[PDB]
Assembly symmetry: D3
Homo-oligomer: 279 residues x 6
């Protein structure tokens, strides 16, 4: 399995540069009509789920003969401030689409509308009827990885075989989620990447599609990423800190998490602050 | 007037059997794609409105030369825990349709969406223009029974004669409400009956329509009902206790009643918990 | 004893004030609450009938039906019963400092489960959810009814660190009232300048007489009941209507909302009062 | 510039007449299917913004060689009780349309749905792209009056010239807002005017259009207005007092203002009380 | 007496700090609140102008307009007036324990109706909604203005159980300040390490001098006013701007929301403080 | 001193109770909370790992990784860290009067920033956000970490009206525990009838021994930890699992919601308890 470059050194922007880049991110969100976010495992590290390629990442530790460490189970994990900031950005109509490589189920469990989300690598809580393609979002992890039989049968009125949604190394991306992600990415005038190294094709390349027809690209990550050279703005810090400052400049609160909830469909936007005068 | 079998003895499932049947009801709600509820006077007894055929029912007492007793007026009556649990089940998209034989106005006053409700026997708070068929939901009971003239005139811009909506013994069921009820009942994969003896045609037979094409039928009642033999599950207890345990297993709170409110149209579902793994 | 016990006057005819008289009496009750510095409420089984608990001496009361060879009807268990609008209005009146004390003959546990502060409540006849250590007198408020009546052994033992025998708090016919609850009820009743009675026939001694103590030194007495009561002649105002309708109108005149019930909750101690509307000019 | 009749004496209905007229207004709102409100500068005087023609109005003071006095800036001004009562009336589906002559931005900043609002004289917070006609609702006043260049450029993906939306004396009314106002006014069965002298054509005449095909007209103002003779009901008092009593009779609370918020689109109505029996 | 009464300097020119100076002064006010252990606020009629109550000595003040033969303008009645953003910011500052005491010259009743705790408020000039028993000194907070000015008989009688004559609390020109309110204001002012004045010209003795007591033993004084005030020279910081804009920016720097107003409410007694943000490092 | 300092047993193997045993132990913990009159919690670095703060002696602990020549990893700064479900469950347990005292070895500041009342909290090892006047002992809770460790001068001066030198509160290896916090922890621990330890290995003297004081005069001890702890043999119940999973199940059995975190807030003093569910019958 090609696991790419693992355990690169972290970069930390010093405070004054950090504060000034988040103001510039604010400016781009205000100026943009179609904003798409791309998330990876870096946005879940602050709730106790290790990443893949970070200092204590899954791959990084296995390369050194060590184990990844979980400070939580998938079921007891709480969405981060970043997760909840993405919920609110979608509710006030500032986020058009969310593209995620994470199988951790937290975006769905955060209350984020599934019809605005592409889970490119599947969802550990989601099993899907082989025949009728009906998905079930379960309250516990389904039990298998690699699109195998879970043991359970479809209940739609069918008795179809339910399989997990976790892609194995050689498994192709779900076409609907990839097509929705690719469509949102081409149409975006701003793509913001959060805690991904962007080292996986084609997930990691979707943000680049935004640069075609003059879109802007922002990369928020602690480590270098595959596409650092193509970004108009790279922010080297904790995504929780970036997103709490961004939300403060936008005049938005980060909503409370009520515990695990499934929203199928986005609502019309809630009221949002009026926009600053720019330049 | 055929008043059927009145004052049958109550049945109480003992606690362990009761707890186990409500878990089975939970399982059927989770497994079902289209759930229809049928309510009668048993769901209003806990707010001080007597039923018809129960031990102290209207008919039961008149058969013995006694009076029904009200512990409230129709106007001061509050929706029960069961009423409010039905509001929440509809808001989170677990209830497709509600079919009620009650004229007590509480489902509407509970905030329940009128476009998901069939009031088969009319509403004591609702008067309707003879000519333009415009309904008014009033804050007090309209004053007459049997589709007579209330005294008031239509205000749409008409001066049509306003009549009560309470069917007398020989009066046919409103076709729109009966057609919507019959349609929801045939399409349901689960019908749950709450505090009805099911002794009235065709209201009491609508739940049976669900058994055609393999639907399941659940009867919640203290007394035997006309159709006990056709049920996959009969729960003999207080509907308030059944529904508060059901809501607990589903991970749903019973919302506060803000006082009397009219919602014409259902909204898209609110977020709900993810589903348990079954079998 | 229990069989022969005097159950008083049962099944007396109900009275309904007509709407204009009813509307005018609730306005007068509002006026007396506004004018009063110490308001004490006395409740009985009439305030619980609208949540499916039958009363004792009403048309379908427990004693009334027994007299006719019939059974009373429950539309709920004690555990699944919800406090009425009246219960929740009393919670709010205490929170905004307009109720000084609450004196109740009810064993139905709903005042405590409503969230009403126990240090402002006298449960004269006990509480079906409450057991008490014979040894150290520590009370436990349970989530289910305790099991026994008549100050008997429940089966459970005290857990204070004692292992005392736990007993129910339900008075049998010949059992004396708890001294502390009677002394606090009697103290609040003498000091009240307004006593309001809700859904009691006031037929039991001394529970039913406590409201009269308010009339000494010029206190005013208000009786809210569908039936006549033992002390109708001593009342400055008698309201014949459903307590839920009286209390929801009263709360509307006072500018107070009836708070939501979160499900069963035990509050031991009252807080300082919440803000309340300013008072009308009365003259 | 024709500034009409300025500084007319105020009229105050005495309390018993005042209370009785607001009950009659309540009755007309209950009886009406399409209610349109017309607002002018009188509904903003209670938040410290002077009117034009009132005792201390802009024009009235300039006629006497004095200045208008502001007790607030446009940015720090809070919507009045009347503003917030109009928000709630629209949310519960009792207000069809709102027509405003005010440039003070408070209706938008109150959270009122822009697709139900006609700002006939423009909005001091709103600038608009000369070319693509895209509007921006800014957090501060834009800086110019009379449809001039603000200095800023369009950001839609264009670089169009942004202009203020404030009509000068000779500038024609925006056709879309005037057409929506005129359409709502003809279709209304009740028009209620709040704190306008109705002295400006065609804004001040729109309410009269309601009287065609038998609509009712209510004028709430402290001074005489151009069209007093055409009203079925004239209420001489503070609009805050009229609207707080009206809201009390309707059983509606006046919602909290969360600070400045932009809602583009109206939602389906929230639940509302059932209606009184009338006559 | 009333006709000849010295109404001081009326209609002095307004001052507007330009935006960058204004932004920097509010940051400095934030810093002084953070650094201070005892913060006392002094309010006058300037904090009520944004809800439609004209002031006394502003460009359109009551006295200013009288001097020019003109009338002041009300955009509201006293009863329909809503507390400003400033009123509600003072409520929150008291709730989170950052305001020790509030001293007000206003008779407009809005501080009380805002829900501000009366035991932390000195109403130096009285309250138009408040009448007081001549006999027993019991105050009543009414929902409408009481009717009279100058400590006269209102017409109503006391209801404590007294039948005392009820009088308004509005001081006439020659009437002495209530001793209790002056002594509590004077005590809080001497003990304050920060006094902030909002919308008063500080021209009235001794109300306008209380803030100076803070300067003794090294207290800091902040004056927020659109016009010059009697004591501008003694201030460590003078902010020339709209009080609503100053207080909404100050609350933003402090990390505090301005709470919703529920409509008119009377709170007699302050609660323990609510949680508040932790303090910035200052050096 | 610091280099040679005994860092105890680091990187001991993790234990996971299987789900049925885990479910049954949390039910037993629920039972002990219900049965107990004085419940004291002892927390350490294990309750902060789920918000991205590594512990000391866990598999990736600070000391564990140092032993292997590796670095610990932070997924957050101290300032951007959010309190865990466990932190917020402890807030609620204190609010409903089911937690008497909280004793913590953590310097991460999250208990204070969670809104937990400081007068019920002993921070045995100090708080990175808290500096203290050398002269007058006045503490300041800052919005950012103070800058220094080992009771050194921060650079700032006291603002009480004093100009005392402000020092950090972080104990160095040889620094004695603050007397007041140790005496209040020791007092609560002796008087507890239940001590529950969450995410501490209990290896530090005397912090790690305080829970044992509860076992004297028949107190019960519960240890919640993924690894063995120094005092496993003295525990009446050891739960080997994630503290977030244990505490969310415990709160579910108790009928309590885990309240929302508003962002960083300092509460100095506890309030009277909020209402809580009535207790199950246990026998
Ligand atoms: N709090 C944080 N803030 C900012 N950046 C962070 C944080 N925590 C970690 N990082 C950075 O977060 C980045 C995480 O990058 P990777 O670990 O490759 O995760 P992926 O989502 O991109 O991997 C995609 C797929 O690859 C796998 O095979 C699976 O199939 C995954 O689905 C690093 O650069 C960290 O520095
Ligand atoms: N709390 C309770 N929980 C459970 N069951 C209950 C409860 N209370 C009563 N019951 C049961 O509730 C059942 C109520 O049955 P019926 O009284 O016939 O009412 P309907 O709605 O079916 O009557 C339909 C029409 O008939 C009339 O002519 C009118 O036109 C009505 O509209 C009994 O079996 C009770 O045991
Ligand atoms: N919804 C209602 N609204 C108003 N009044 C009502 C309502 N329902 C009933 N009432 C009236 O409520 C009144 C209730 O009177 P009683 O039934 O004697 O109850 P107690 O609490 O005074 O019985 C005292 C003790 O006696 C026993 O032996 C036990 O020991 C009790 O503790 C009636 O007059 C009804 O008209
Ligand atoms: N609180 C109040 N309650 C009731 N009436 C009020 C109140 N305050 C003021 N009034 C009355 O409010 C009325 C305000 O009338 P005008 O001042 O002409 O404002 P417009 O909106 O109609 O002027 C329209 C345009 O004319 C300009 O050129 C601009 O272009 C404006 O856009 C008076 O009769 C006051 O008595
Ligand atoms: N919105 C505003 N923002 C800021 N400052 C303001 C505002 N509006 C007005 N001001 C300023 O607010 C200041 C208000 O000063 P004065 O009008 O003398 O009121 P007092 O409360 O001190 O009068 C004291 C007593 O005197 C009387 O005789 C009664 O007895 C009073 O109780 C002005 O300088 C305005 O610039
Ligand atoms: N999410 C989790 N859930 C449950 N247990 C956990 C979790 N994460 C870690 N643990 C356990 O949490 C335990 C934490 O034990 P230690 O790391 O020694 O921390 P202390 O607070 O007791 O260190 C005391 C002092 O020593 C220092 O020198 C400083 O001065 C400290 O103040 C481990 O056994 C983990 O298994
Ligand atoms: N709102 C309220 O407070 C409220 C209202 C009603 C009730 C109520 O009905 N509870 O049961 C008490 C009861 C029932 C029957 C008998 S008769 C009897 C006698 C002997 C036996 N073995 C069985 C029944 C006896 C009593 F007192 F007579 F025993 C007592 C409780 C509380
Ligand atoms: N909601 C409202 O009622 C409301 C009230 C006022 C306003 C508002 O400010 N609009 O401009 C009107 C205006 C202002 C000043 C002058 S005089 C002037 C202007 C600028 C300078 N530099 C000097 C004098 C003149 C006018 F017409 F007299 F010129 C006209 C907007 C809304
Ligand atoms: N925010 C505030 O606190 C506030 C602001 C303004 C006001 C205010 O305007 N209230 O009326 C007081 C008043 C008005 C006119 C006169 S002149 C007069 C004299 C004699 C008669 N008969 C009538 C009017 C006299 C006063 F003091 F001079 F009498 C007193 C009240 C409160
Ligand atoms: N949840 C919690 O409470 C929590 C968990 C973890 C931590 C934590 O990691 N904080 O830093 C303390 C620390 C780090 C390294 C060293 S080693 C060292 C020695 C000398 C220098 N100059 C630098 C590093 C030393 C210490 F103690 F050894 F110094 C102390 C803090 C709090
Ligand atoms: Zn299938
Ligand atoms: Zn009609
Ligand atoms: Zn005991
Ligand atoms: Zn453009
Ligand atoms: Zn008196
Ligand atoms: Zn000091």
């Amino acid at each position: 399995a090609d696991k790419g470059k693992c355990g690169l050194p972290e970069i930390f922007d010093p405070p004054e540069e950090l504060e000034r880049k988040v103001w510039e991110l604010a400016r781009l969100v205000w100026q943009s009509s179609s904003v798409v976010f791309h998330t990876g495992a870096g946005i879940s590290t602050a709730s106790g789920i290790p990443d893949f390629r970070g200092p204590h990442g899954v791959w990084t530790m296995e390369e050194r003969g060590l184990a990844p460490k979980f400070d939580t189970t998938f079921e007891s994990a709480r969405p981060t401030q970043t997760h909840m900031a993405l919920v609110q950005l979608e509710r006030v109509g500032l986020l058009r689409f969310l593209v995620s490589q994470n199988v951790d189920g937290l975006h769905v469990r955060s209350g984020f509308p599934r019809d605005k989300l592409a889970e490119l690598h599947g969802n550990m809580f989601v099993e899907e009827c082989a025949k009728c393609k009906t998905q079930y979002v379960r309250d516990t992890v389904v039990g298998t990885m690699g699109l195998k039989a879970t043991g359970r049968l479809c209940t739609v009125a069918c008795r179809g075989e339910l399989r997990d949604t976790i892609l194995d190394w050689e498994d192709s991306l779900p076409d609907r989620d990839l097509a929705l992600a690719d469509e949102a990415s081409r149409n975006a005038d701003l793509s913001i990447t959060l805690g991904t190294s962007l080292q996986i094709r084609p997930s990691g390349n979707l943000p680049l599609a935004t640069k075609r027809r003059g879109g802007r690209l922002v990369i928020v990550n602690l480590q270098p990423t595959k596409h650092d050279r193509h970004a108009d703005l790279r922010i080297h810090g904790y995504v929780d800190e970036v997103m709490t400052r961004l939300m403060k400049h936008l005049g938005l609160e980060i909503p409370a998490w009520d515990g695990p909830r499934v929203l199928e469909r986005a609502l019309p936007p809630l009221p949002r602050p009026p926009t600053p005068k720019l330049e």
